[PDB]
Write a protein that binds this DNA or RNA. Structure first.
Ligand SMILES: [Mg+2]
Ligand SMILES: [Mg+2]
Ligand SMILES: [Mg+2]
Ligand SMILES: [Mg+2]
Ligand SMILES: [Mg+2]
Ligand SMILES: [Mg+2]
Ligand SMILES: [Mg+2]
Ligand SMILES: [Mg+2]
Ligand SMILES: [Mg+2]
Lengths: 150, 51, 117
RNA sequence: CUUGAGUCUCGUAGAGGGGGGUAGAAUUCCAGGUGUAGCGGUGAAAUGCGUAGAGAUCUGGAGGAAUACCGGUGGCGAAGGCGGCCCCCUGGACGAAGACUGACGCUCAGGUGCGAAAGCGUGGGGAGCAAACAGGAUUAGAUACCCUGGUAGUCCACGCCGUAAACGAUGUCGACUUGGAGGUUGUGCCCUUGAGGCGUGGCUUCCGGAGCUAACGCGUUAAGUCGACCGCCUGGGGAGUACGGCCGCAAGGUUAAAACUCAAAUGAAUUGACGGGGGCCCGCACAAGCGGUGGAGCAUGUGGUUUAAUUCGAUGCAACGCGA
């Protein structure tokens, strides 16, 4: 409201070393079972290996690049009407937005295990396809189509 | 209103005569005349045209 | 086609819409751009960021004649009175005499009342 | 007799008035070229206007009304009210010296004249705006607010009506009572030796002193202190209505009650409250996230219903696994 904060970081990657990566393990983590999150966010790259090849490190971020937006809109009421003024999202929440929408679809795959339900979307990005990547450009639709605002 | 000024560029300067017309002299009109409403406000703004 | 190189382009900025008509040198249409027919309208149109797209849209519908240096004529307080111009100084078009015509009667007519929202 | 009031001389400013011409900007319309799938409008829309070519853009023409900037707490007028420019006829005001008149003045029931806007009669006029009216839209309804159109009227000449929050809501004339800053318009004067420095008048804003006032406030342009004359008030509703008289083409105006009914109606100001008033500032209030309820089955309370009883209390949040 009238106060300001910084950020709530935590223990990074268990070994591959990657602070932000933790989010992918947290954001996805449910019922506070991080002990299992590491069992999914890690085993995931162990499967994309043969899938992609090059360091799973890049593999992630690689396709991830085709999932992170860069411009959204925020409802702002004025004189009764509430415009949808656009706004370019900084990297901080950008990368986050992706992970959210990414892990989501993965849990909507509706197949069997998540380990695979996760890799699919992790690669579906680069090759382009899936619900996750969908939102990416889907957001672009609302974007600019309202450029008449901001 | 007129504009020529050479020298390659495109800064602005569209503010020259601007402060002597614009949507101001226009907004001044367009809608029904004031008739009596001016003699009041145009002479009520003076109340502030002092302090 | 005819090749003028030296033409004009008046800007009609109305509070609700705006149209960019690139005329020749003696006052002859050559292509008109309209904010309304820009794939968007209503509350989306009118705005500068939008109503301007029409102006610069003239190029791929006017330059077919071939023009370089030119002046500009603005007439209308519409929300694009200026925005529209920039598109011209970025679409490749040169620039020359930029004068505002926008009419102003010396107190003759009588505008309508209304506006009781 | 002259200080009141008035005439003469010379000048001073001004939208004072009546008449007659004239100018430029803009809208509308009509015409022609260019050019093409939209314009216009709104919160959005729709009606409306577009391919029979609008809109825009340019060229020519017609017409009516109004006079941007100047322009202002500016000015003039009894008030109403009066703005481009020029001419003609014409009213008042003001300053300068004296000259002349010699109380010839103040006020005024009745009487007479002027009267915003709308409206009325006759004949003209008609671009823009717009009662009425017709569509479109909003709404539960919307005979409205909004949009698209649009007749009277708004304009002119003559005649009529005489009303307005005709307001400073403050009758006119005269005499006095601290001052401060500004406006505007005459005139005397200072190296004029500057724009300016000092006087003295006419009108004019803002402030405020004593005083006045119920208070708000007024305060040398008084609501202060005095005088001359006139107009009017006497509880609220009934009612500025009825009846009559007078005036008017009419619409209506003017004069103006009673019955009955109430204990008030009312003015200024104080405290709080509230506002689809303003400024400012907080709380998982929202915004940013995660996970839920209403879905399903069951548990528990409740309302209802039922019963011989379904013991009683708890009810917006602040009752409903609450007293239990
Ligand atoms: Mg209307
Ligand atoms: Mg006067
Ligand atoms: Mg009249
Ligand atoms: Mg008549
Ligand atoms: Mg005072
Ligand atoms: Mg009161
Ligand atoms: Mg808290
Ligand atoms: Mg929320
Ligand atoms: Mg939900």
């Amino acid at each position: 409201r009238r106060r300001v904060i910084g950020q709530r970081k935590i223990l990074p990657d268990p070994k591959f070393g990657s602070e932000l990566l933790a989010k992918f393990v947290n954001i996805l983590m449910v019922d506070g079972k991080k002990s299992t999150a590491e069992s999914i966010v890690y085993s995931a790259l162990e499967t994309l290996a043969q899938r992609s090849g090059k360091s799973e490190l890049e593999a992630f971020e690689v396709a991830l690049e085709n999932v992170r937006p860069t411009v959204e809109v925020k409802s702002r009421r004025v004189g009764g009407s509430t415009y949808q003024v656009p706004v370019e999202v900084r990297p901080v929440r950008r990368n986050a937005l992706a992970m959210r929408w990414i892990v989501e679809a993965a849990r909507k795959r509706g197949d069997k295990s998540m380990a695979l339900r996760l890799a699919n979307e992790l690669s579906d990005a680069a090759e382009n396809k899936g619900t996750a990547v969908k939102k990416r450009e889907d957001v672009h639709r609302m974007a600019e189509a309202n450029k008449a605002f901001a | 209103i007129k504009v020529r000024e050479n020298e390659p560029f495109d800064v602005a300067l569209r503010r020259f005569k601007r402060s002597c017309e614009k949507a101001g002299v226009l907004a001044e009109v367009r809608r029904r005349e004031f008739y009596e409403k001016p003699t009041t406000e145009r002479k009520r703004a003076k109340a502030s045209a002092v302090k | 086609r005819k090749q003028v190189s030296d033409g004009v382009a008046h800007i009609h900025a109305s509070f609700n819409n705006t149209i960019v008509t690139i005329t020749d040198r003696q006052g002859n249409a050559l292509g008109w751009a309209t904010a309304g027919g820009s794939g968007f309208r209503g509350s989306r149109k009118s705005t500068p960021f939008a109503a301007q797209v029409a102006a610069e849209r003239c190029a791929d519908a006017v330059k077919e004649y071939g023009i370089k240096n030119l002046e500009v004529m603005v007439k209308g307080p519409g929300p694009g009175r200026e925005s529209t111009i920039r598109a011209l100084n970025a679409a490749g078009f040169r620039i020359t005499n930029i004068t505002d015509v926008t009419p102003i009667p010396h107190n003759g007519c009588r505008p309508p009342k209304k506006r009781r929202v």
